[PDB]
Write a protein that binds this ligand. Structure first.
Ligand code: NAG
Ligand code: NAG
Lengths: 248, 226, 147, 218
């Protein structure tokens, strides 16, 4: 939809990735101020409000902690407490039809000052006073739901821009929306460090002849020294041997 | 169960703006596309607009594109379509429908194969001053056979004043005339029934015309000029 | 015997735990609604999940909001009472619920014999075989020889 | 808009016999996989509309599968293999790729019967309808089929168009016929100044124009 009908999508249980935004795919803009671009894919976030809609491209440069403008304070407010990032991509063909796409309108001259992250799906008659008009804007109200240029080559003042604003709240119990541990390949017959789902150690780990049970993960000895393990990805059994030492 | 409740229209004088609302259930709102498809009483269905899982609206119909404004209230499962300059082409039963296809219908939102349909609104385009109803009886040709008879309530306002015959005695094979527009703006209907031809000489008929808005019924005389 | 209701108040005020088994489904619910105390026979809602010759053991406990349900089926051919034998007990369900529980009751249907015992914080010794199954055990508080 | 049409618009089809209807759109429906989007739908007065076939050829659920779809691009021909009064009705087709979407006329499909005997009648005004400033007369065909019936008003070699309205009804399936009512309204100032008022309506079975000429209310 357009910005006047902006989509509030509560989204979680996902894989936060910034590669798709710039380098995996060359979307127009990925902008934010407090959270680093590179740290999105390795921190785990509970839930995120996604503001997914289409806005005028002319006021995308209005998108800032302040920088009030047509969109920034009349179509959707972007305050300083921007705990998240905005992902916009140009949609010249997608949101501008040659024959007139009189559907992705914009809420011009909004009724009231935009509330903090207001659900500006409010699509009503622009407020002027206490006059009960007969459905016709009289002398002080325009048509707030006004149409863009709607050309395939929209000017600088009417560019078509798609927007997903991610604002993340990790205050609630985690829904674990993040990439899981970066699982490398497996090493046989080499003294290496290792972390298996919380089990931290260092040794040489090799193929085994022991047989486990479906509920069993670890393996010990007389003195509670970890001796066997199962690969988290797939069913198999690896013995662990300490790296050699001695006297010289 | 499923029952899509759409409303918002009524005694709407043309040249005013409203917000038709459809409430829907039986699914997940912000992941399925609700579509406005109009169908005027006596006219075929026609697509108006739609809104999808990403709120992915598309457009409006032939001469209505732009005056309407489509918005969604995802939480309470509501869909508001703005009404501007509702005329005989812009007024209809604004059915709200759901496409069966799931996410990524392909690129386009699920908008085809929408077999499930709710109850559209009843936007109407006629408003005026009032005056008492009048009726004219109808007798067949001025002659064991077949004939058709009724009593046309004409120059009345508003519709309907229900028509039957002698407490529903002889009304098998019934057909009701819709309303008609005269110069002033007062409707006219009747209820003509396929019966035998005892109309003219041997009977002085009476038909029931029911002024339902005032909770009144009239058993009025029916006979040709003789 | 397929029904279990766990709780404290059991008047749809606090989280009531229901574990029941439909003919083709296994239903587990934690919600707060007083339902029928007797399912029929043929011939709030924070977390839910759906799919004599038999002797079934089920051990129930709960620690730190973690419910533990250990279960083992076995065949028998006897009617008078359980025989004398030894067997292990695998762990089969853990549930992160986080609810206060004080009492329970089984749930049946209408168209005889079931035992309940209680636990204590004891100190045991166990003999793990070569494969990894608990084939024998002993207690340290029964009698001098045992300790 | 989309220039959408259907053919034939109104064909007499006997229930139990196959019936082919078409759709011609204006804006293309081809995604880059060979997708045909112009679904086939049906409209019935009184009940919810029927979706005939979605995606052109995939016989849609919720309706009998007796409809078979074919076509490509914007051309979409559906043949009902064996239509029944349950499948007879108004016909439409919907597309969901490029806005705006404009529909066809709506193919009226009904019951076709062999030639029957028409029951043509007229309703001269009663006693109170003469002086009241309006003397309306209804010319009604009942027990007449086929549905088509051209109507002419003959007064002093003049035709009453615009001053006369027409009202139609549903089908009388007992004899598979209809009812047409040409309703003429005229003020007392000029209605009674002449004598002859001929409703000439042409039933197909009786080819000569059926003329109901009435001097005045009777
Ligand atoms: C992960 O995916 C691979 C694909 O072959 C499969 O072999 C393996 O069993 C899977 N491991 C799981 C589900 O733990
Ligand atoms: C223990 O392991 C061996 C080899 O797997 C096999 O005999 C069987 O699995 C077990 N034998 C017992 C319990 O006697």
């Amino acid at each position: 939809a357009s910005v006047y009908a902006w989509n509030r999508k509560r989204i979680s249980n996902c894989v936060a990735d910034y590669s798709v935004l710039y380098n995996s795919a060359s979307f127009s803009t990925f902008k934010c101020y407090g959270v680093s671009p590179t740290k999105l894919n390795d921190l785990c976030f509970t839930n995120v409000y996604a503001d997914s809609f289409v806005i005028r491209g002319d006021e995308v440069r209005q998108i800032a902690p302040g920088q009030t403008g047509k969109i920034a304070d009349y179509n959707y407010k972007l305050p300083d407490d921007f705990t998240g990032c905005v992902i916009a991509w140009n949609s010249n063909n997608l949101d501008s039809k040659v024959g007139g796409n009189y559907n992705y309108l914009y809420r011009l001259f909004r009724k009231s000052n935009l509330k903090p992250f207001e659900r500006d799906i409010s699509t009503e008659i622009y407020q002027a006073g206490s006059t009960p008009c007969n459905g016709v804007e009289g002398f002080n109200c325009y048509f707030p739901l006004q149409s863009y240029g709607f050309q395939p080559t929209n000017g600088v003042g009417y560019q078509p821009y798609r927007v997903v604003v991610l604002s993340f709240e990790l205050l609630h119990a985690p829904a674990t929306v993040c990439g899981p541990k970066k699982s490398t390949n497996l090493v046989k017959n080499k003294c290496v460090n290792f972390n298996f789902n919380g089990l931290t150690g260092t040794g040489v780990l090799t193929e085994s002849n022991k047989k486990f049970l479906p509920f069993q993960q670890f393996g010990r000895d007389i003195a509670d020294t970890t001796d066997a393990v199962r690969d988290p990805q797939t069913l198999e059994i690896l013995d662990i041997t300490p790296c050699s030492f001695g006297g010289v | 169960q499923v029952q899509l409740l759409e409303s918002g229209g009524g005694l709407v004088q043309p040249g005013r703006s409203l917000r038709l609302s459809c409430a829907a259930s039986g699914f997940t709102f912000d992941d399925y596309a609700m579509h406005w498809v109009r169908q005027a009483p006596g006219k075929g269905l026609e697509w108006v607009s739609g809104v999808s899982w990403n709120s992915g609206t598309i457009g409006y119909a032939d001469s209505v594109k732009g005056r309407f404004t489509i918005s969604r209230d995802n939480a309470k499962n509501s869909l508001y379509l703005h009404m501007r300059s509702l005329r005989a082409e812009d007024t209809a039963l604004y059915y709200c429908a759901k496409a069966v296809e799931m996410v990524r219908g392909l690129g386009a939102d699920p908008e085809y194969g929408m077999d499930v349909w709710g109850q559209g609104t009843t936007v109407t385009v006629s408003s005026a001053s009032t005056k008492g109803p009048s009726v004219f009886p109808l007798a067949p040709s001025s002659k064991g056979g077949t004939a058709a008879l009724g009593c046309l309530v004409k120059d009345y306002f508003p519709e309907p004043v229900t028509v039957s015959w002698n407490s529903g005695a002889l009304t098998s094979g019934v057909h009701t005339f819709p309303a008609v527009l005269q110069s002033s703006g007062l409707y006219s209907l009747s209820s003509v029934v396929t019966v035998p031809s005892s109309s003219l000489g041997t009977q002085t008929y009476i038909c029931n015309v029911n002024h339902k808005p005032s909770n009144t019924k009239v058993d009025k005389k029916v006979e040709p000029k003789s | 015997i397929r029904g279990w209701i766990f709780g404290t108040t059991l008047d749809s005020k606090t989280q009531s735990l229901l574990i029941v088994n439909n003919a083709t489904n296994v239903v587990i619910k934690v919600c707060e609604f007083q339902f029928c105390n007797d399912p029929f026979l043929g011939v709030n809602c924070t977390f839910e999940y759906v799919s004599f010759k038999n002797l079934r053991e089920f051990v129930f406990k709960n620690i730190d909001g973690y419910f533990k349900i250990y279960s083992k089926h076995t065949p028998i051919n006897l009617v008078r009472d359980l025989p004398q034998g030894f067997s292990a007990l695998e762990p089969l369900v853990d549930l992160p619920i986080g609810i206060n529980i004080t009492r329970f009751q089984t749930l049946l249907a209408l168209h005889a014999a079931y035992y309940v015992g209680y636990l204590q914080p004891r100190t045991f010794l166990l003999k793990y075989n070569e494969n990894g199954t608990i084939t024998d055990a002993v207690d340290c508080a029964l009698d001098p020889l045992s300790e | 808009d989309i220039v959408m049409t259907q053919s034939p618009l109104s064909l007499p089809v006997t229930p139990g016999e196959p019936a082919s209807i078409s759709c011609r759109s204006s804006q293309s429906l081809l995604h880059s996989n060979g997708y045909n989007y112009l679904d086939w739908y049906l409209q019935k007065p009184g009940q919810s509309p029927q979706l005939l076939i979605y995606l052109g050829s995939n016989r849609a659920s919720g309706v009998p599968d007796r409809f078979s779809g074919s076509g490509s691009g914007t051309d979409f021909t559906l043949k009902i293999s064996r239509v029944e009064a349950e499948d007879v009705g108004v016909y439409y087709c919907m597309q969901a790729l490029q806005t705006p979407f404009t529909f066809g006329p709506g193919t009226k499909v009904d019951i076709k019967r062999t030639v029957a005997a028409p029951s043509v009648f007229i309703f001269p005004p009663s006693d109170e309808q003469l002086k009241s400033g309006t003397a309306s007369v209804v010319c009604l065909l009942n027990n007449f089929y086929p549905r088509e019936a051209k109507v002419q008003w003959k007064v002093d070699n003049a035709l009453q168009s615009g001053n006369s309205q027409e009202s139609v009804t549903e089908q009388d399936s007992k004899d598979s016929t209809y009812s047409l009512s040409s309703t003429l309204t005229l003020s007392k100032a000029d209605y009674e100044k002449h004598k002859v008022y001929a409703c000439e309506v042409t039933h197909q079975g009786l080819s000569s124009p059926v003329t109901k000429s009435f001097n005045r209310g009777e």
